[PDB]
Design an enzyme around this catalytic site. Structure first.
Site, PDB file in Angstrom:
ATOM      1  N   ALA A   1       0.789  -1.226   0.000  1.00 48.02           N
ATOM      2  CA  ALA A   1       0.000   0.000   0.000  1.00 48.02           C
ATOM      3  C   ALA A   1       0.822   1.278   0.000  1.00 48.02           C
ATOM      4  O   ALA A   1       1.837   1.381   0.679  1.00 48.02           O
ATOM      5  CB  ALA A   1      -0.966   0.006   1.201  1.00 48.02           C
TER       6      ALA A   1
ATOM      7  N   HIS B   1      -4.714   5.065   7.241  1.00 47.50           N
ATOM      8  CA  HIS B   1      -3.306   5.431   7.261  1.00 47.50           C
ATOM      9  C   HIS B   1      -2.968   6.092   5.941  1.00 47.50           C
ATOM     10  O   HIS B   1      -2.371   7.174   5.904  1.00 47.50           O
ATOM     11  CB  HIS B   1      -2.397   4.217   7.422  1.00 47.50           C
TER      12      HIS B   1
ATOM     13  N   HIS C   1      -2.092  10.257   4.324  1.00 43.91           N
ATOM     14  CA  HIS C   1      -1.122  10.800   3.400  1.00 43.91           C
ATOM     15  C   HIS C   1      -1.884  11.707   2.434  1.00 43.91           C
ATOM     16  O   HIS C   1      -1.555  12.895   2.285  1.00 43.91           O
ATOM     17  CB  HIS C   1      -0.412   9.690   2.623  1.00 43.91           C
TER      18      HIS C   1
ATOM     19  N   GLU D   1       3.558   9.995   8.277  1.00 37.55           N
ATOM     20  CA  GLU D   1       3.064   8.682   8.676  1.00 37.55           C
ATOM     21  C   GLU D   1       2.124   8.706   9.882  1.00 37.55           C
ATOM     22  O   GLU D   1       1.599   7.663  10.244  1.00 37.55           O
ATOM     23  CB  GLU D   1       4.223   7.741   9.014  1.00 37.55           C
TER      24      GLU D   1
ATOM     25  N   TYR E   1       8.576   5.785  10.953  1.00 38.74           N
ATOM     26  CA  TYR E   1       7.509   5.066  11.629  1.00 38.74           C
ATOM     27  C   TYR E   1       7.640   5.145  13.128  1.00 38.74           C
ATOM     28  O   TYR E   1       6.635   5.322  13.845  1.00 38.74           O
ATOM     29  CB  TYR E   1       7.482   3.615  11.182  1.00 38.74           C
TER      30      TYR E   1
HETATM   31  C1  X8Z Z   1       2.019   1.302   4.192  1.00 45.30           C
HETATM   32  C2  X8Z Z   1       2.826   2.125   5.201  1.00 45.30           C
HETATM   33  C3  X8Z Z   1       3.622   3.285   4.584  1.00 45.30           C
HETATM   34  S1  X8Z Z   1       2.591   4.477   3.709  1.00 45.30           S
HETATM   35  C4  X8Z Z   1       3.836   1.218   5.902  1.00 45.30           C
HETATM   36  O1  X8Z Z   1       4.837   0.771   5.269  1.00 45.30           O
HETATM   37  N1  X8Z Z   1       3.670   0.910   7.194  1.00 45.30           N
HETATM   38  C5  X8Z Z   1       2.548   1.358   8.088  1.00 45.30           C
HETATM   39  C6  X8Z Z   1       2.841   0.799   9.426  1.00 45.30           C
HETATM   40  C7  X8Z Z   1       4.095  -0.025   9.348  1.00 45.30           C
HETATM   41  C8  X8Z Z   1       4.633   0.050   7.946  1.00 45.30           C
HETATM   42  C9  X8Z Z   1       4.805  -1.335   7.319  1.00 45.30           C
HETATM   43  O2  X8Z Z   1       3.974  -1.833   6.602  1.00 45.30           O
HETATM   44  O3  X8Z Z   1       5.921  -1.930   7.602  1.00 45.30           O
HETATM   45 ZN    ZN Z   2       2.713   5.620   5.332  1.00 48.69          ZN
END
Ligand code: X8Z
Ligand code: ZN
Length: 598
Positions: A316, A345, A349, A373, A485
């Protein structure tokens, strides 16, 4: 002389020229073909040269001596050339190596554990479902092993040249390394230490959840599979990288008997759809007087995994095409409670994007990567509370028992507290590489010793310097900084606590209005605060963006801890009652070789 005319002209071009690059990045990542890969890299090479030339033209304007910042702020930022500082030959070689790991990750396929004929199972749908639902340690072991050998190991070489060019590019900009270059994004010489500090305050909390989860897992899987005092075997925490453990709440929640906040199945029964979920997400923002999703979003966004046999990247993401109202999200959405937060989430953005369109291209980003984030996660916190889930009917009859409250904080601790040390290790590891602190001969153990020290977790099976696991994590493969994050999970609570206060939902004094139960949904003063902050977009260092939100200018742990206070106290007692072991002994899963074929 006035360069305000120059910069205005230049930003407008950059925003035009980045648009082009963005459409090729977006075509590629929606359909992984060599051609699309070639066009994508082509554009970036072109943009890179424009930058080099744009960078030397600014020598004309001596901004190091100018009058007003902002102007003096746009140059420092526009002249900070990232990889584009690399000469032609290397920038291109970096793009290739960079393309190699990205597509390797996305193209992974393993054979079904019980049907070696298929072999078309992919990470997003299939594998993530197995790791999440299976309760056969040997089967989770299979899928762990099968995925880390393809996603990480296979791309060790490219990853090594990546670090090399990364370092080269950073010294080409007067940075010590790629490490110090990422940190620069937070404009604070003591940032890393502030983070090392906050982690220390919450750690004790982290080491009560750890021993507890380990207690149940060992009670459930058995002594032979999970040992007391030893680090927790991954593959059993319900997540490929163990960054979050909520998926195993069915076997480790203190009150599976007491109502479990698992809307996930009530969603499927109500015929919930990806589209309906985005619309619900659109609603929250408008409820707060925030901006509504534009027409290009619904026309261009891909919100469900394509059904053809094409390859694509499905981790995503949200896209800013740098125009007016052209924002799109790409998600392989599924109807489950975790995906619901994700939608929000991502919309966080999108919101930010819309909030700062008017800003000069250079400033069209987030104040500090952390802020980007967190937006959407703050709304997700509201959506996760009994209050808001009942209000939308995804929780029919619910009683706030007391021990039902413990679950509501515990289910949250597995994603929010647990994550803090995971995300910290991700960049501490890549920082130690960017800095020449580790020997290539120890590259794979430093990663695991680091997962050991901070998280208390270890691989299912013994790995060695022969393997290379770091790349099994999307962000390591796609070169995406991870500290954003950690910072988000901390300050998103700072935002949430203030929003709820500006909204008539949170009162520290009396009860009946506990932090873990506000909804800020439909709150105007909340979105208002959210507008003063979002609209600024990089136009000012982050201490200023936050201060626009609630009058404060410091990042702190006074938000998560206050939020999880009732959990932390419930545990200490419980851990003594069950005689639960806290802390763990170093791991024996990083070695080298050893076979029985003579
Ligand atoms: C999709 C989002 C970024 S827009 C992300 O990578 N996240 C959100 C929370 C943790 C981390 C992951 O998937 O490792
Ligand atoms: Zn993100």
């Amino acid at each position: 002389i006035q360069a305000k005319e120059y910069l205005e002209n230049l930003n407008k071009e950059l925003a035009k020229r980045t648009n082009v690059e963005t459409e090729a990045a977006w075509a590629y990542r929606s359909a992984i073909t060599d051609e699309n890969e070639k066009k994508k890299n082509e554009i970036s090479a072109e943009l890179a040269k424009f930058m080099k030339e744009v960078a030397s033209d600014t020598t004309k304007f001596q901004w190091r001596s100018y009058q007003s910042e902002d102007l003096k702020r746009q140059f420092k930022a526009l002249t900070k050339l990232g990889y584009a500082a690399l000469p032609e030959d290397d920038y291109a070689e970096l793009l290739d190596t960079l393309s190699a790991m990205e597509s390797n990750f996305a193209k992974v396929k393993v054979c079904d554990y019980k049907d070696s004929t298929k072999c078309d199972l992919a990470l997003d749908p299939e594998i993530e479902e197995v790791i999440s639902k299976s309760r056969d340690h040997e089967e989770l072991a299979y899928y762990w092993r099968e995925f880390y050998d393809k996603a990480g190991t296979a791309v060790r070489s490219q990853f090594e040249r990546y670090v090399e060019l990364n370092t080269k590019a950073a010294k080409l900009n007067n940075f010590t390394s790629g490490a110090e270059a990422w940190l620069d994004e937070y404009e604070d010489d003591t940032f890393e230490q502030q983070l090392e500090d906050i982690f220390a305050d919450i750690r004790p909390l982290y080491q009560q959840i750890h021993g507890y989860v380990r207690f149940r897992l060992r009670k459930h899987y058995g002594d032979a599979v999970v040992s007391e005092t030893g680090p927790i075997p991954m593959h059993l925490l319900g997540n490929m990288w163990a960054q979050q453990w909520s998926e195993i709440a069915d076997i480790v929640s203190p009150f599976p008997e007491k109502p479990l906040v698992d809307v996930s199945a009530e969603m499927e029964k109500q015929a919930y759809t990806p589209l309906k979920m985005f619309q619900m997400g659109d609603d929250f923002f408008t409820s707060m007087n925030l901006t509504k999703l534009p027409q290009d979003f619904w026309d261009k966004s891909i919100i469900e995994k394509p059904t053809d046999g094409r390859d694509l990247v499905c981790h995503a993401s949200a896209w800013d095409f740098y125009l007016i109202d052209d924002v799109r999200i790409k998600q392989c959405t599924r109807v489950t409670q975790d995906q619901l937060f994700t939608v929000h989430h991502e919309l966080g953005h999108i919101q930010y994007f819309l909030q700062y369109q008017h800003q000069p291209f250079v400033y069209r980003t987030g104040a500090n990567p952390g802020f980007h984030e967190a937006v959407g996660d703050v709304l997700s916190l509201s959506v996760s509370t009994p209050k808001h889930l009942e209000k939308i009917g995804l929780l029919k009859d619910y009683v706030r028992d007391d021990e039902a409250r413990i679950n509501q904080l515990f289910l949250t601790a597995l994603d929010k507290i647990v994550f803090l040390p995971f995300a910290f290790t991700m960049d501490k590891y890549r920082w130690s590489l960017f800095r020449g602190e580790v020997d290539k001969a120890n590259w794979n153990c430093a990663f695991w010793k680091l997962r050991d020290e901070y998280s208390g977790i270890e691989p299912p099976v013994v790995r060695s310097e022969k393997d290379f696991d770091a790349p099994a994590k999307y962000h390591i493969s796609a070169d995406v900084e991870y500290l954003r994050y950690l910072v988000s999970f901390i300050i998103q609570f700072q935002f949430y606590k203030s929003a709820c206060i500006k909204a008539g939902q949170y009162d520290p004094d009396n009860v009946e209005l506990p932090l873990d139960n506000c909804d800020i949904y439909g709150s105007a003063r909340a979105g208002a605060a959210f507008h003063n902050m979002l609209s600024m977009g990089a136009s000012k260092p982050w201490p200023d963006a936050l201060e626009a939100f609630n009058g404060e200018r410091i990042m702190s742990g006074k938000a998560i801890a206050e939020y999880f206070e009732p959990l932390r106290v419930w545990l200490e007692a419980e851990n003594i009652k069950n005689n639960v072991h806290i802390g763990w002994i170093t791991s024996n899963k990083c070695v080298s070789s050893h076979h029985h074929h003579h």
